[PDB]
Specification:
part of a larger assembly, 7 chains, A mainly alpha, B mainly alpha, C mainly alpha, D mainly alpha, E mainly alpha, F mainly alpha, G mainly alpha, F: mainly alpha, two-stranded antiparallel sheet, G: mainly alpha, two-stranded antiparallel ribbon, globular, binds digalactosyl diacyl glycerol (dgdg), binds chlorophyll A, binds 1,2-distearoyl-monogalactosyl-diglyceride, binds beta-carotene, iron (chain A), photosystem ii (chain A), Cytochrome b559 subunit beta (chain A), electron transfer activity (chain A)
Chain lengths: ~35, ~35, ~80, ~325, ~350, ~140, ~450
């Protein structure tokens, strides 16, 4: 019966959420033609 | 009802090599490819 | 050895985690993709698009020279 | 009981103050020859025509150099890769003018250090130790071989070998950056990771052991006296070190196994130096660092500079001035 | 139970990520530094400050992206978002290099927070604070290189940019303009870092190859218990090996581990001292004896004089593009160059 | 800016005429340049003989001038010295000699036109085009 | 056979060590690996063919396998121009199909067949300590290796020949009719100094010498195989060597490291076995080609290339080597030992001949020098050709650079592997590879050094 939301959960999301956002953005850039 | 951890590791590794290979593709296409 | 929190191996091997993350991770990925592909990021950060580094009136670097009034210089640089 | 057997027992003796061994029977003469010739040359050698254009470079202290500027100058470009011992010169002064001391010192040094590696294995074998200290020592050996042997071979001249001196080393590095963009080579980047990380981990391990020493002394004496040479018992609490470090980062980023930790400490810088040695060794064959010059173009096709372009300007500045009188043709092909 | 004690209780809980009082300044500051760097390297240009593309969005790669230093025109202005330059406009703040002081100042306070975290955890766990003291080397380097060097120079422009190739540019700039390799302080730093790597490799290898046979398997790693009282490797055998190989050997393990901290840390401090000298253009640039002689004696050449020539070439060929605000117009005929090349 | 119509407008002849390469033609000319001429004409130089480069002043000083498309196409059919005197067919890559230059044997008249046009448009996109080997 | 740490003492990252005394599964691992090698040969060759532009020179297309086929004289004609792509395609397909047979056999022996062959056969069962049988295996393989060398000989003599870059009237495939059987020349090659001007065996410069060498190699290898099958190791070798599987692995690792360094040097320096029309110029060739190219230009502009002193006082185009040979000036003075089929016509007994350099130049020589100079084996890791300060428009890295760099790295890491396994084999034979016994630590019974 572990808790769902803890300090570790927030430490994981604060980094993981913008990281996947940025990875998708950088993926989009791979197709930008000059 | 638990997905084996080795399957999760394989799926994540495939996706990570995929994003890395997409980033290396972009080195040769689009912006920053010198052509 | 355990500080109280659920072990990561128990979390990522569970059905509910992936039921949530099969949508959350892709939605974040597509949010970033759209941030770039709609041209929103150029406007947000002021990064020149590939056809806006040089304009008709300016063929050289838009190097900043004012100490304070930079809104004006960047506007004249276009 | 034979005299040869007695000599073998003496050579392989583990009771000699300095172990000799069979590898030592080669190490000692070669390294001694290299040291003698190096000291004599560094002090007194006349100027050397490194670039083969009859423009001798003063390397020795008595010819105007200080410790920082002094060097044993690599042999003339006119020699190229030709073997140039003393007995191939019509006079010792011709030998000196053409940089013979460099060839003698480097060849004896190279042999001596490979024998030093073999000697490390040999003593470990005689002491009943595990045999791989020589493997770690093979990293600096590989780097030294790269700069003194492999790079000259690939470039075609011992004149392109690293000079035996401080400012000579900087010249080598600058020229190397100008012609190979070593900063932008991934293997040099792994070498920098190896050395920065080796220092980081040395500091981390030293600080964690020093932080976790078992109380054994009084406040009036050095804590080092709390350790006795040969003691059975561990002198610091690895459990306390792991508690601290696993709270500094997270529990799973900390070692609880000293054997695993000491392996990592050995492997990281060793692997990083192997990569950098191989990087220098491969740019010997002109497989250079990354080139991103004019990689970014705008829509019209105009070049947008990046930091790599500014680095390239620095490299061109270095390249156009190096060996200012040695080039007669437009491209520096070696 | 007072509120301060209750807060100190929650902050010092044993969780996956320890927080502590230091975390209130380490975590937001480190997160601002890291997010600012990722943001700038992904989206932000250096077009208006350096005339360079510096983000992934413009086409740069991991090696060529950077949070570039601000334009020279701002001097050492702290470039606050609300400051008189950006005036609260986020886009203008990005375009003038405002992310460089953001990353540098949040990183400086994050480094302070990390050292405070070292001290706090050391005190809680009950050990000596030598890990915190060791980390002073990295802070000395960060302060001297990213703050004091540009503070002594004309502006933040000449601070190193937060990027791979930005750092490489800074390195080559210090070579060509400061003759930083000739600086004894850098030489002591090189000795410290290389000696630290050497000590790391040789301790690791020695320990792994003097291990006691504590188990039946070829996998010697399983033969160690964290709570065991006995040394896992023979210090006597190691000492004899190195005494007979190298002539000398460590005989005190405490001194060995102190030396492993002392060497790299001392090297970082010494290099930082040298960089502080470079902030004021106090450089070990020349040996005047050799310059006077080469001036009078045209037959006289050393590796030192050759490096001087290399530096002059770098400066002349790099200045116009590296310092675009100075409008350096150097016509081709004045550019120093050897024959042919 | 974009690769405008004025950027790809280049002299076709010496009699004053002008032609505009399409973006497809500019791209094709660039591709042939990178594939066949850069080994010697990197960034408008000439490694084997930098007295005769691809800079605009140099192309314009040839006999007859080579700063128009048709002269360039002729040069790549029948190359000559800088003064129009000596035969360079066995010395410079050209389509007239597939035996000695097999790399060029599949380039049609449209391809040669495109690479001449690119050669004329590249100097407008780079100030360092046609400079010193190191510059 | 144990497949876990508790049963073998070897962790997962040292798992293949669990096969040391499982001869059947070890044989399976070996045959499946051979299958990997042959698979790469076939698949990479088919890739090179699919990516091959027949008219464009081989060294401009990132090819390293088709040059090997073309040197053997398949699919090419005079000056190395491609006559038919089908032989390269056939070579690739035959390797690709055989790869499947070896993969099957390997997966069979590794997974299904006997784990130990000792019981099954006396012929295939081996014990590492059984010196007679291990020498039998050495012998059978030495006879197949010598047969392969004779296969090269047969291809060069009776089956269409091999590419001779030194052929009169231009490079071409030649049938070798008089291979050098003279043991003085052949073994003299082994005795030449590995320095500039001599080059040990790297300086082999004619197909007759290469082919005569392979007749000797086939003969010596076949004889040594027969000797090893009919003999047993003698006493001195039984006493100076470690007799174990890891020891033999370390010996082969040392040999492989030596061969890797040798191959690196071979491809970098020699243009006979590695023709420049397939591999591009050696760096020595590119430098000499630059000197030659500007010799011809300036001479045609009317300069006296003989009497023109450069800014240093040495001749700008021509000078003397330290032994007096007339050589090209400039930094290329280092590559004055370079020999090339386009240069050697202009060389006299004293070196470069003024009469030849003033009257016998040919347009093909000028074209070749221009091509070789602009294809100097200089390039970046992302394949931007030419000097590192050049801009991004030339996509080229020499095959010589790729091959030399790759095999130097592999040679070095295999030297490291030799040291790893040789030290481990020694310690394991002696019984302290697992660490120091606490009771009988040798240093505790040795006197103090001081
Ligand atoms: C220990 C480790 C612990 C960790 C540390 C982490 C904490 C980080 C937070 C500190 C940040 C401080 C930023 C200071 C900014 C600054 O200084 O900004 C500089 C300004 C001065 O501004 C400068 O002033 C210069 C001189 O100006 C004068 O002269 C000019 C020419 O004649 C004009 O006349 C001008 O009008 C006139 O004012 C130029 O104009 C510059 O362009 C302009 O930027 O001083 C000032 O704000 C204040 C000056 C006094 C305070 C000095 C403290 C800072 C120490 C800097 C040391 C400098 C030299 C050492 C180098 C070695
Ligand atoms: C075991 C014994 C070990 C110790 C015994 C003695 C030590 C030898 C060590 C090598 C010393 C070589 C130094 C100079 C190398 C050199 O001048 O050049 C290399 C020579 C090749 O010689 C060259 O050979 C060439 C031959 O080409 C000639 O012939 C050709 C024919 O096609 C062409 O025509 C060509 O144009 C023509 O010039 C030329 O003669 C050159 O002038 C000549 O220099 O290598 C060779 O001879 C043989 C190849 C040797 C490989 C060594 C390189 C790697 C060394 C190990 C690295 C260890 C790293 C691990 C660190 C831990
Ligand atoms: C060249 C590569 C190579 C080869 C040939 C082998 C071969 C072998 N390994 Mg090793 N191994 C390797 C690399 C290799 N390994 C690496 C890189 C590692 C580190 C991860 C290991 C770690 C390792 C461990 C830890 C162990 C082995 C063991 C073994 C042996 C038993 C295999 C077994 O039962 O697996 C069973 C595996 C499977 C049944 C999974 C499927 C495998 C098949 C072969 C896939 C083939 C697919 C292929 C495309 C089919 C083509 C068919 C047709 C076209 C021909 C076998 C001889 C074991 C051993 O020593 O036994 C005593 C053992 O314990 N290996
Ligand atoms: C001897 C080996 C060898 C050599 C010399 C080459 C050489 C070449 N290949 Mg080939 N190739 C090889 C093996 C080799 N390849 C293998 C094994 C594969 C299967 C994956 C391929 C697949 C392949 C393809 C699919 C293609 C090439 C291409 C090329 C060309 C361009 C290479 C390039 O851009 O690299 C870029 C350089 C790198 C990626 C650097 C790699 C760095 C390695 C991983 C470092 C490892 C070093 C060390 C061993 C690490 C050990 C660590 C530990 C021991 C401590 C070049 C001619 C290209 C070409 O032009 O084709 C016509 C192409 O498209 N190759
Ligand atoms: C180095 C390779 C090698 C070695 C040493 C062995 C050895 C062995 N195998 Mg294996 N095998 C291999 C490769 C190898 N095999 C490959 C590639 C395959 C896939 C086709 C197989 C498939 C296989 C099966 C399915 C079986 C064996 C069996 C056996 C055993 C008895 C062989 C036999 O019938 O007696 C001697 C056999 C002959 C003298 C006739 C065969 C000789 C070959 C087919 C012709 C010559 C080889 C080649 C075409 C010419 C040169 C090769 C070229 C690359 C130069 C023996 C331990 C059997 C076993 O385990 O028994 C218990 C068994 O059932 N093997
Ligand atoms: C892969 C091939 C191979 C392998 C693994 C072996 C393996 C062996 N051979 Mg065999 N041999 C071979 C091929 C091979 N041989 C061939 C082709 C022939 C025909 C000429 C022979 C003829 C032969 C004879 C006549 C004898 C052996 C013997 C032996 C055994 C000990 C040899 C020894 O100590 O070497 C190590 C070599 C030495 C100790 C000699 C010292 C040489 C000094 C160190 C100079 C070394 C040169 C230098 C280090 C390297 C320079 C590099 C460059 C030359 C490449 C060993 C089982 C002996 C034996 O016991 O017979 C059964 C023996 O008397 N071999
Ligand atoms: C033919 C050559 C050969 C053979 C048969 C062996 C065989 C063996 N070695 Mg040795 N080894 C070799 C060469 C060889 N080695 C070389 C050249 C080196 C130097 C680098 C070593 C270094 C070495 C060490 C340090 C150890 C062994 C060990 C072992 C044993 C277990 C190996 C295992 O399971 O690996 C499992 C395989 C893996 C874990 C995979 C390794 C992955 C590496 C890092 C990748 C290398 C780069 C690769 C090219 C990919 C690059 C591409 C990249 C972009 C992804 C086994 C007997 C172990 C031992 O002593 O056991 C008794 C051991 O500890 N070997
Ligand atoms: C095990 C994980 C799973 C691995 C499998 C997927 C991972 C990544 C693969 C994706 C790569 C994209 C393929 C390119 C798209 C096709 C377009 C094309 O032909 O080429 C596109 C370009 C241009 O090339 C030309 O393009 C033409 C027009 O499209 C035609 O397609 C021509 O045929 C083509 O030659 O070529 C390249 O960019 C090739 C280089 C890059 C491709 C491979 C990148 C590296 C792959 C992964 C390695 C790095 C990952 C690191 C991980 C660490 C552990 C190893
Ligand atoms: C600046 C700013 C700010 C802030 C912000 C932030 C905080 C941000 C964040 C951001 C972030 C936080 C992001 C992130 C990202 C990340 C990324 C980008 C990632 C990447 C990754 C990768 C790419 C990797 C890869 C790899 C490798 C290399 C290894 C292994 C494998 C893999 C594949 C994984 C504010 C608002 C205050 C204000 C204004 C300014
Ligand atoms: C084909 C060819 C050829 C030929 C060649 C030949 C003829 C070969 C031979 C070769 C050989 C003939 C080889 C050999 C080798 C050697 C070696 C490699 C050795 C080694 C040894 C060892 C290893 C030892 C060891 C030891 C010691 C040191 C002592 C004691 C201990 C021991 C035992 C450990 C030629 C060039 C003409 C040309 C080209 C082609
Ligand atoms: C080259 C050939 C080297 C031959 C050297 C040994 C000759 C073989 C005679 O037989 C060997 O005699 C040696 C003496 O050295 C004995 O010892 C061995 O028991 C025996 O195997
Ligand atoms: O000797 Mn020393 O540094 Ca090798 O690159 Mn070419 O050569 Mn010279 O010029 Mn740059
Ligand atoms: Ca070409
Ligand atoms: Cl220089
Ligand atoms: Cl030159």
């Amino acid at each position: 019966t572990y808790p769902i939301f803890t300090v570790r959960w927030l430490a994981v999301h604060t980094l993981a959420v913008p990281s996947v956002f940025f990875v998708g953005a950088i993926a989009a850039m791979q197709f930008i033609q000059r | 009802g638990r997905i084996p951890l080795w399957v999760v590791g394989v799926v994540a590794g495939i996706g990570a090599i995929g994003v890395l290979g997409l980033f290396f593709y972009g080195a040769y296409a689009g912006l920053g490819s010198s052509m | 050895g355990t500080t109280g929190e659920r072990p990561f191996s128990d979390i990522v091997t569970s059905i509910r985690y992936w039921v949530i993350h099969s949508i959350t991770i892709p939605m974040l990925f597509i949010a970033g993709w759209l941030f770039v592909s709609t041209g929103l990021a150029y406007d947000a950060f002021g990064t020149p698009r590939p056809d806006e580094y040089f304009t008709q009136t300016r063929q050289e670097l838009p190097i900043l020279q004012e100490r304070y009034d930079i809104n004006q210089e960047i506007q004249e640089f276009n | 009981a034979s005299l040869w057997e007695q000599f073998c027992q003496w050579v392989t003796s583990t009771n000699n103050r300095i172990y000799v061994g069979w590898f030592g029977t080669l190490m000692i003469p070669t390294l001694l020859t290299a040291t003698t010739c190096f000291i004599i040359a560094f002090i007194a050698a006349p100027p050397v025509d490194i670039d083969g254009i009859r423009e001798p470079v003063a390397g020795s202290l008595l010819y105007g150099n200080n410790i920082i500027s002094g060097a044993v100058v690599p042999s003339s470009n006119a020699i190229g890769l030709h073997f140039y011992p003393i007995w191939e010169a019509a006079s010792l002064d011709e030998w000196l003018y053409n940089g013979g001391p460099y060839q003698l010192v480097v060849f004896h040094f190279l042999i001596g250090i490979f024998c030093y590696m073999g000697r490390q294995w040999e003593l470990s074998y005689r002491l009943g130790m595990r045999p791989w200290i020589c493997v770690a020592y093979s990293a600096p050996v590989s780097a030294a071989t790269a700069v003194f042997l492999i790079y000259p071979i690939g470039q075609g001249s011992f004149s392109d070998g690293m000079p035996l001196g401080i400012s000579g080393t900087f010249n080598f590095m600058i020229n190397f950056q100008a012609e190979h963009n070593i900063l932008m080579h991934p293997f040099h980047m792994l070498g920098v990771a190896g050395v920065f990380g080796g220092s980081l981990f040395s500091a981390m391990h030293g600080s964690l052991v020093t932080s976790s020493l078992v109380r054994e002394t009084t406040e009036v004496e050095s804590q080092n006296y709390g350790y006795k040479f040969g003691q059975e018992e561990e002198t610091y609490n690895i459990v306390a070190a792991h508690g601290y470090f696993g709270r500094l980062i997270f529990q799973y980023a900390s070692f609880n196994n000293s054997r695993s930790l000491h392996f990592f400490l050995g492997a990281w810088p060793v692997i990083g130096i192997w990569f950098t040695a191989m990087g220098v060794s491969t740019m010997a064959f002109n497989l250079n660092g990354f080139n991103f010059n004019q990689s970014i173009l705008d829509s019209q096709g105009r070049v947008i500079g990046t930091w790599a372009d500014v680095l390239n300007r620095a490299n061109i500045g270095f390249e156009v001035m190096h060996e200012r009188n040695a080039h007669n043709f437009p491209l520096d092909l070696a | 139970r007072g509120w301060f004690d209750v807060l100190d209780d929650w902050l010092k809980r044993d969780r996956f990520v320890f927080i502590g009082w230091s975390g209130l300044l380490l975590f937001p500051c480190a997160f601002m530094a890291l997010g600012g760097w990722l943001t700038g390297t992904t989206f932000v240009t250096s077009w208006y400050t350096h005339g360079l593309a510096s983000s992934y969005l413009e086409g740069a790669n991991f090696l060529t992206v950077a949070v570039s230093s601000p334009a020279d025109a701002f001097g050492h202005s702290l470039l606050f978002l609300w400051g008189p330059e950006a005036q609260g406009n986020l886009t203008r703040w990005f375009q003038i290099g405002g992310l460089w002081p953001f990353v540098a100042l949040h990183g400086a306070f994050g480094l302070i927070g990390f050292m405070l975290r070292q001290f706090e955890i050391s005190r809680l766990v009950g050990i000596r604070p030598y890990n915190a003291i060791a980390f002073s080397g990295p802070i000395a380097v960060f302060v001297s290189v990213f703050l004091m060097y540009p503070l002594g120079q004309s502006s933040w422009f000449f601070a190193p940019s937060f990027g791979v190739a930005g750092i490489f540019r800074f390195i080559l700039f210090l070579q060509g303009f400061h003759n930083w390799t000739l600086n004894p302080f850098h030489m002591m730093g090189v000795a410290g870092i290389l000696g630290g790597a050497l000590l790391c490799a040789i301790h690791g290898a020695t320990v792994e190859n003097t291990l006691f046979e504590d188990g039946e398997d070829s996998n010697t790693f399983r033969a160690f218990e964290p709570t065991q009282a006995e040394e896992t490797y023979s210090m006597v055998t190691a000492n004899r090996f190195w005494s007979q190989i190298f002539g000398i050997a460590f005989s005190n393990k405490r001194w060995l581990h102190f030396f492993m901290l002392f060497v790299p840390v001392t090297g970082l401090w010494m290099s930082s001292v040298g960089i502080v000298g470079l902030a004021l253009n106090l450089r070990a640039y020349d040996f005047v004896s050799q310059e006077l002689r080469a001036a009078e004696d045209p037959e006289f050449e050393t590796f030192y004089t050759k490096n001087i020539l290399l530096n002059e070439g770098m400066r002349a060929w790099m200045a116009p593009q590296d310092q675009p605000h100075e409008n350096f117009i150097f016509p081709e005929e004045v550019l120093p160059r050897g024959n042919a090349l | 800016v974009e690769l405008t119509e004025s950027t790809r407008t280049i002299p076709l002849d010496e009699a004053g005429g002008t032609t505009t390469l399409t973006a497809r033609q500019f791209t094709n000319g660039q591709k042939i340049f990178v594939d066949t001429c850069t080994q010697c004409h990197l960034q408008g130089k000439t490694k084997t003989n930098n007295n005769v480069s691809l800079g605009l002043a140099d192309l314009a000083g040839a006999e007859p001038r080579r700063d128009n498309v048709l002269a360039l196409v002729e040069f790549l059919k029948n190359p000559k010295s800088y003064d129009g005197e000596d035969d360079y067919s066995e010395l410079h890559p050209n389509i007239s000699r597939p035996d000695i230059y097999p790399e060029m044997r599949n380039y049609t008249e449209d391809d040669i036109f495109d690479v001449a046009g690119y050669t004329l448009i590249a100097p407008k996109l780079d100030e360092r085009w046609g400079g010193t080997i190191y510059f | 056979g144990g497949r876990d740490l508790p049963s073998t003492g070897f962790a997962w990252w040292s798992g293949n060590a669990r096969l040391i005394n499982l001869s059947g599964k070890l044989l399976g691992a070996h045959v499946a690996h051979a299958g990997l090698i042959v698979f790469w040969a076939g698949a990479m060759t088919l890739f090179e063919v699919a990516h091959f532009i027949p008219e464009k020179p081989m060294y401009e297309q990132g090819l390293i396998l088709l040059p090997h086929i073309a040197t053997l004289g398949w699919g090419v004609g005079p000056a190395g121009e491609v006559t038919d792509i089908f032989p390269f395609f056939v070579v690739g397909v035959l390797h690709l199909i055989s790869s499947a047979v070896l993969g099957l056999g390997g997966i069979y022996h590794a997974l299904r067949g006997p784990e130990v062959l000792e019981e099954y056969s006396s012929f295939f069962g081996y014990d590492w300590k059984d010196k007679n049988q291990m020498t039998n295996i050495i012998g059978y393989h030495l006879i197949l290796l010598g047969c392969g060398a004779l296969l090269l000989v047969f291809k060069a003599m009776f089956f269409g020949g091999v590419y001779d870059t030194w052929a009169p009237g231009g490079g071409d495939v030649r049938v070798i009719t008089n291979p050098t059987l003279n043991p003085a020349i052949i073994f003299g090659y082994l005795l030449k100094a590995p320095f500039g001007g001599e080059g040990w065996i790297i300086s082999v410069n004619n197909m007759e010498d290469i082919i005569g060498g392979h007749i000797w190699i086939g003969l010596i290898c076949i004889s040594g195989g027969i000797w090893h099958i009919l003999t047993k190791p003698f006493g001195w070798a039984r006493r100076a060597l470690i007799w174990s599987g890891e020891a033999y692995l370390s010996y082969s690792l040392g040999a492989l490291s030596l061969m890797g360094f040798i191959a690196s040097v071979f491809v970098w320096f020699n243009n006979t076995a590695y023709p420049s029309e397939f591999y591009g110029p050696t760096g020595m060739e590119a430098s000499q080609s630059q000197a030659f190219t500007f010799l011809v230009r300036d001479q045609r502009l009317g300069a006296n290339i003989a009497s023109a002193q450069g800014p240093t006082g040495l001749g700008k185009y021509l000078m003397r080597s330290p032994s007096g040979e007339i050589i090209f000036g400039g930094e290329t003075m280092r590559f004055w030992d370079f020999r090339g089929p386009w240069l050697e016509p202009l060389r006299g007994p004293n070196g470069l001949d003024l009469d030849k350099l003033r009257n016998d130049i040919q347009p093909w020589q000028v074209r070749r020098a221009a091509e070789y100079m602009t294809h100097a084996p200089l390039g970046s890791l992302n394949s931007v050709g030419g000097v590192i300060t050049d801009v991004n428009s030339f996509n080229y890295v020499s095959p010589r650079a790729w091959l030399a760099t790759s095999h130097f790295v592999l040679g070095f890491f295999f030297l490291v592997g030799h040291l790893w396994h040789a030290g481990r084999a020694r310690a394991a034979a002696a019984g302290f590879e697992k660490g120091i016994d606490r009771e009988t630590e040798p240093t505790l019974f040795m006197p103090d050094l001081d």
